[PDB]
C-alpha cells in the first residue's frame, strides 16, 4: 500500500543508462529548494519546483523515466509539505481558518495557475492539492476531476500514464475517500496510443524497441490499478477486465491486471486468463511474464477444482517451450510450488525432469542457483515422509546438479535439518539410508584446513543427528557394522567420532542387557570386536582431557563384560602429555575406577 | 537617528466598494522619544493613461482627500498607534473605476503617509494601496468554432497548412470574471499531429476620444492546455482562470475603454500557426 515500497522497487528495477550525476543534480535542486525556502524566499521555492517538474514533460532518456519520476516527485512532495505547514503556521475547520492564511493560499493557487506549460502546472498543483482544504470543505473533490481531465492534454502515453500514477498517489496520500477511477478509463481511451503509429516512430527515432519500450509501463500501470481496484467491488473489477479484453493488444494490460488485482480474483479466472494469454501476440510483451504473474497469483489462491490439472497442463505445455533457460526458470519456480501443492509425486517428478532438462544445457544452472535453491526448498517443504522424498527417481540427480561446493553443502545442511526436525523414529529403509549417506559424505567433504570451527560444530551436529537416527532393531552385529562404516566415512570430523564411540559402547551395554549376562560365544566374539573397535578409535581423538575420559569409560564398559587393563595402561601412559581442576578430577575418577578393577 | 513607520489596512484582502469606508491604523516603532512636527496621510485615486508609442490623454483623478494625522508632538520609544479613516464616495452620480493594472490604463488607489523630523533625524515617506471593486452589473454565449485552414481568413498563403479539422467550443465569451473560461477542443483530424495548443488572453485598450486615438493590444497570460499529439476524438479541456485584478470588467468611458479577447493558438509539428481570435465581454457578476 505505501508508496515508499514501490518507490524502492522502481528505483532498484530501473537503474538504467551521468545518471548518478543526474540524480545528484535532482537532489541538489531539492537542497536549493530547502535552503531558499528557509530564507523566506517563497517565490524562489515555487520557481525551482516548476523547473524540476518541467523535467518530467521530456522523455529523452526513455528507459530511466520511472526513476526520474520517483525522484522529482519526491522533491514535489517536499514542496507540498513545506507550503502546507507554512500555511498551517499562519493559522480546526476551513471556515475557522483565518482570512490571512486564506489570502496567502489563494495567492499561492493563482501563482501556480498562471504557468505557461500544462505538465508543470499539473505537477505543481497536484503537489499542493492538500492546501485546497482551507479554501472550502470540498476543495479537493472539486479540484481532482479537473486534474484528471487536464491529463488529456498530454499525448505521449508514457507521460500521461505516469501523471495518472502521481495523481492517484496524491489522492491516496491526501484524500483517499471513486473520482480517481475515471483515470483508468481515460488511459484506456488513450491506450491505443501505445501501439499507435506516432509512438512507434518516436521510438524508432530514439533508438528503442517495442519489447523494451513497453516494460516501462508496468510500474505506473500497476500503481494505477492498485489504487483504483483497492477494495473495489466485484462489478467494477468485472467491468475493468471486460474493457481490458476487447482492447486490441491487451498483453501488457493483462500483465498489469495480474500484478495489481487480487490473486483471489485472478485465480478463479484462471481459464479466462489462460485463453486470453493464448490469444495475445508474442511480438511485443512476452507471454512468459503473464504466465509468471498467473503462477504468482495461484501461489496465493486456488482455482476451481474442475480444471486445475488442465491449468497445469496448459502452463507446462507453454512454459516448457521457453527457449531461454534464464527466462524459463524465473517462471517455473513459481509454478513448481503449485505443482507440488496440488499434485502427487508423479507430477512433481515429471516437472523435476523438465527443469533438469531445461537448466542442464551449457551449464546454464550456473547463473540461476538462487531460483533452483528456492524450488528445492519448496520441494523439501512439501514432502514430510523422507522415504517418499527419496522414492522420487529424480531427487538425487537434482542434488548432483549443484556441482558447486558452497551451494551443495548448503543444500545438504538444509536437507539434514529437514530430516532431524521431521524424523522421530529410526529408519532401516535402504533407500533413506543410502540417500542420507551420500548427502552426508558430500557435506563432510567440505571441511579443510581453512574451515572454521563453528562450521565444524554445525556439521558435527548434523551428522550426529543423522547417525542417531539409524537403528537395526535386535540385530546388533549389523548395527556395529553400520557404526564402523560411519567412522570410516566421518574420520576427519571429531565430534562424530566421539558420538560413534559413545554409541558403540552403548550398543555393547545393550547387548549385555538384552541377555542378562552369560554372553553366548557368538556374542562374546561380538563384544570383543566392539571393544577392539573402541580401542582402535580412541587414539585418533585430538583432544586430551576428552581422550582420557573416553579411555576411562571404555575401561569401564570393557570391564563390564568380563573382557579383562590395556585401556588403563594407555590412559596412564598418556597422562604425562597433559587446567589443574580437570586433571585432579580425572585422577580421582581413575582411582575410584581402579577400586574395582 | 531613524525609526520604523508603517500603515496598516483593516481588511486583509483590501477589497472595497462604492459606498464603503476605508479604515486603518498608522503604527510607529521608535528607538527614541522622537519629537516631531507632524505625520500626515493622503488618500488618492488616479488613472495613469500613457500614450501610444495629446488632446484628452491627461491623467484624471477619481477621489482625493488628506488629513494631517499628527500635529507637532513627540513619539516615545516602543510602539505607538493612531487610527485613521477615509470615505469612498464621489460627487453626484460618478462611480469609482476598477483597480486595473495594465500598460496604457493603470487605475490605482493609494495611501501616502509622510513623517517630518528635525536635527538628529530626517523626514520619511511611505506608500500603500488598496483594492477597489466595480459594482455588479447574465447570459452565456457559447461560440462553436472549427479551426481549419480554410476558415483562417488571415491565412492567405494557405499552401503550407496541412489538412486538419479541429472542433470544439467555448462555454461562453461573456465570462463572469470570478468564474473560469471553460470549453472543449477535439482534434477530429490532423495530418500533422498537434505540437501544442494555447489560450492567450489579449487585453486591448483605447485611450482617447472619437477625434483621434490609438488602439493597443497586449497579452495578459499564455497558458497551454495540450502538449504533443493528443488522441483523435479525445476532448481536451480548456480551463482558464481570470487574473484577480490584473483583469477588470470592460469599461466604456468618454476618454478610454478597456476590452479583452481570447486567442486559441495551435502549433503543428512544422511550427505552423493557428489563431482564432474570439471576443471577451468580461464582467463582474
Amino acid at each position: 500500500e505505501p508508496w515508499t515500497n514501490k518507490r524502492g522497487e522502481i528505483l532498484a528495477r530501473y537503474t538504467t543508462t551521468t545518471q548518478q550525476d543526474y540524480v545528484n543534480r535532482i537532489e541538489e535542486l531539492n537542497q536549493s529548494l530547502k535552503d531558499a525556502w528557509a530564507s523566506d524566499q517563497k517565490v524562489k521555492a515555487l520557481k525551482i519546483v516548476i523547473q524540476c517538474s518541467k523535467l518530467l514533460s521530456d522523455t529523452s532518456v526513455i528507459q530511466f523515466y520511472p526513476s526520474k519520476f520517483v525522484l522529482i516527485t519526491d522533491i514535489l512532495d517536499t514542496f507540498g509539505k513545506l507550503v502546507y505547514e507554512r500555511i498551517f503556521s499562519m493559522c480546526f475547520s476551513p471556515e475557522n481558518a483565518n482570512d490571512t492564511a486564506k489570502e496567502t493560499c489563494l495567492n499561492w493557487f493563482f501563482k501556480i495557475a498562471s504557468i505557461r506549460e500544462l505538465i508543470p502546472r499539473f505537477y505543481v498543483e497536484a503537489s499542493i492539492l492538500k492546501c485546497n482544504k482551507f479554501l472550502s470543505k470540498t476543495g479537493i473533490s472539486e479540484c481532482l476531476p479537473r486534474l484528471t481531465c487536464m491529463i488529456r492534454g498530454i499525448g505521449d502515453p508514457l507521460v500521461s500514464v505516469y501523471a495518472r500514477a502521481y495523481l492517484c498517489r496524491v489522492g491516496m496520500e491526501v484524500a483517499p475517500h471513486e473520482t480517481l477511477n475515471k483515470n483508468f478509463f481515460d488511459f484506456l481511451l488513450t491506450f491505443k496510443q501505445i501501439h499507435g503509429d506516432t509512438v512507434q516512430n518516436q521510438l524508432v527515432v530514439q533508438g528503442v524497441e517495442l519489447p523494451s519500450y513497453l516494460p516501462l509501463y508496468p510500474p505506473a500501470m500497476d500503481w494505477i490499478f492498485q489504487c483504483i481496484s483497492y477494495h473495489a467491488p466485484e462489478a467494477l473489477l468485472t467491468e475493468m477486465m471486460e474493457r481490458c479484453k476487447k482492447l486490441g493488444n491487451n498483453a501488457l494490460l493483462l500483465n498489469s491486471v495480474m500484478s495489481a488485482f487480487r490473486a483471489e480474483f485472478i485465480a478463479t479466472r484462471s481459464m479466462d486468463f489462460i485463453g486470453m494469454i493464448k490469444e495475445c501476440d508474442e511480438s511485443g510483451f512476452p507471454k512468459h511474464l503473464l504466465f509468471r504473474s498467473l503462477g504468482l497469483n495461484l501461489a496465493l489462491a486456488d482455482p476451481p477444482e474442475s480444471d486445475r490439472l488442465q491449468i497445469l497442463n496448459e502452463a507446462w505445455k507453454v512454459i516448457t517451450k521457453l527457449k531461454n533457460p534464464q527466462d524459463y526458470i524465473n517462471c517455473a519456480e513459481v509454478w513448481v510450488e503449485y505443482t507440488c501443492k496440488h499434485f502427487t509425486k508423479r507430477e512433481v517428478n515429471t516437472v523435476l525432469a523438465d527443469v533438469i532438462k531445461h537448466m542442464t544445457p551449457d551449464r546454464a544452472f550456473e547463473d540461476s542457483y538462487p531460483q533452483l535453491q528456492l524450488i528445492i526448498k519448496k520441494v523439501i517443504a512439501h514432502f514430510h515422509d523422507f522415504s517418499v522424498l527419496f522414492s522420487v527417481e529424480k531427487f538425487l540427480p537434482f542434488l548432483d546438479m549443484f556441482q558447486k561446493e558452497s551451494v551443495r553443502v548448503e543444500v545438504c545442511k538444509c536437507i539434514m535439518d529437514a530430516f532431524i526436525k521431521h524424523q522421530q523414529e529410526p529408519t532401516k529403509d535402504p533407500v533413506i539410508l543410502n540417500a542420507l549417506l551420500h548427502v552426508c559424505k558430500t557435506m563432510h567433504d567440505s571441511v579443510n584446513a581453512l574451515t572454521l570451527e563453528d562450521e565444524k560444530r554445525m556439521l558435527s551436529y548434523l551428522i550426529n543427528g543423522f547417525i542417531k537416527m539409524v537403528s537395526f532393531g535386535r540385530d546388533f552385529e549389523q548395527q556395529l557394522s553400520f557404526y564402523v562404516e560411519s567412522r570410516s566415512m566421518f574420520c576427519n570430523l571429531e565430534p562424530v567420532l566421539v558420538q560413534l564411540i559413545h554409541s558403540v559402547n552403548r550398543l555393547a551395554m545393550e547387548t549385555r542387557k538384552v541377555m542378562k549376562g552369560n554372553h553366548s560365544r557368538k556374542t562374546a566374539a561380538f563384544v570383543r570386536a566392539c571393544v577392539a573397535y573402541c580401542f582402535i578409535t580412541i587414539p585418533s581423538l585430538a583432544g586430551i582431557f576428552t581422550r582420557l575420559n573416553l579411555y576411562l569409560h571404555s575401561g569401564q564398559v570393557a570391564l563390564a563384560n568380563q573382557c579383562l587393563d590395556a585401556f588403563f595402561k594407555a590412559a596412564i601412559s598418556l597422562v604425562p602429555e597433559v587446567s589443574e581442576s580437570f586433571l585432579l578430577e580425572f585422577l580421582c575418577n581413575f582411582f575410584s575406577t581402579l577400586l574395582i578393577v | 537617528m531613524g525609526t520604523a513607520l508603517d500603515i496598516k489596512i483593516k481588511r486583509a484582502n483590501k477589497v472595497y466598494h462604492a459606498g464603503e469606508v476605508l479604515s486603518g491604523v498608522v503604527v510607529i516603532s521608535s528607538k527614541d522619544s522622537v519629537q516631531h512636527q507632524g505625520v500626515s496621510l493622503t488618500m488618492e485615486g488616479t488613472v495613469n493613461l500613457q500614450l501610444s508609442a495629446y488632446n484628452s490623454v491627461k491623467p484624471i483623478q477619481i477621489i482625493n482627500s488628506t488629513i494631517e494625522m499628527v500635529k507637532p508632538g513627540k513619539f516615545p520609544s516602543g510602539k505607538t498607534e493612531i487610527p485613521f479613516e477615509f470615505p469612498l464616495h464621489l460627487k453626484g452620480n460618478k462611480v469609482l473605476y476598477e483597480t486595473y493594472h495594465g500598460v496604457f490604463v493603470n487605475i490605482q488607489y493609494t495611501l501616502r503617509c509622510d513623517m517630518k523630523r528635525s536635527l538628529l533625524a530626517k523626514d520619511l515617506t511611505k506608500t500603500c494601496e488598496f483594492i477597489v471593486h466595480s459594482a455588479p452589473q447574465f447570459t452565456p454565449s457559447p461560440v462553436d468554432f472549427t479551426i481549419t485552414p480554410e476558415t483562417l481568413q488571415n491565412v492567405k498563403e494557405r499552401a503550407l497548412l496541412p489538412k486538419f479539422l479541429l472542433r470544439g467550443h467555448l462555454n461562453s465569451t461573456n465570462c463572469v470574471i470570478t468564474q473560469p473560461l471553460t470549453g472543449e477542443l477535439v482534434v477530429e483530424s490532423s495530418e500533422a499531429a498537434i505540437r501544442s495548443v494555447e489560450l492567450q488572453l489579449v487585453r486591448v485598450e483605447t485611450c482617447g476620444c472619437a477625434e483621434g486615438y490609438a488602439r493597443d493590444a497586449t497579452e495578459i497570460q499564455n497558458i497551454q492546455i495540450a502538449d504533443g499529439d493528443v488522441c483523435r476524438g479525445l476532448s481536451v479541456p480548456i480551463y482558464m482562470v481570470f487574473p484577480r485584478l490584473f483583469t477588470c470588467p470592460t469599461l466604456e468611458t468618454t476618454n478610454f475603454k478597456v476590452e479583452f479577447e481570447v486567442n486559441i493558438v495551435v502549433l503543428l509539428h512544422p511550427d505552423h500557426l493557428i489563431t482564432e481570435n474570439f471576443p471577451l465581454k468580461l464582467c463582474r457578476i
Partner: peptide, 13 residues
C-alpha cells in the same frame, strides 16, 4: 508583456 505570474510578490504570499 507583464504576466499574472511575474506580478505576485513574495510579500503577498
Amino acid at each position: 508583456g507583464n504576466f499574472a505570474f511575474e506580478g505576485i510578490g513574495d510579500e503577498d504570499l
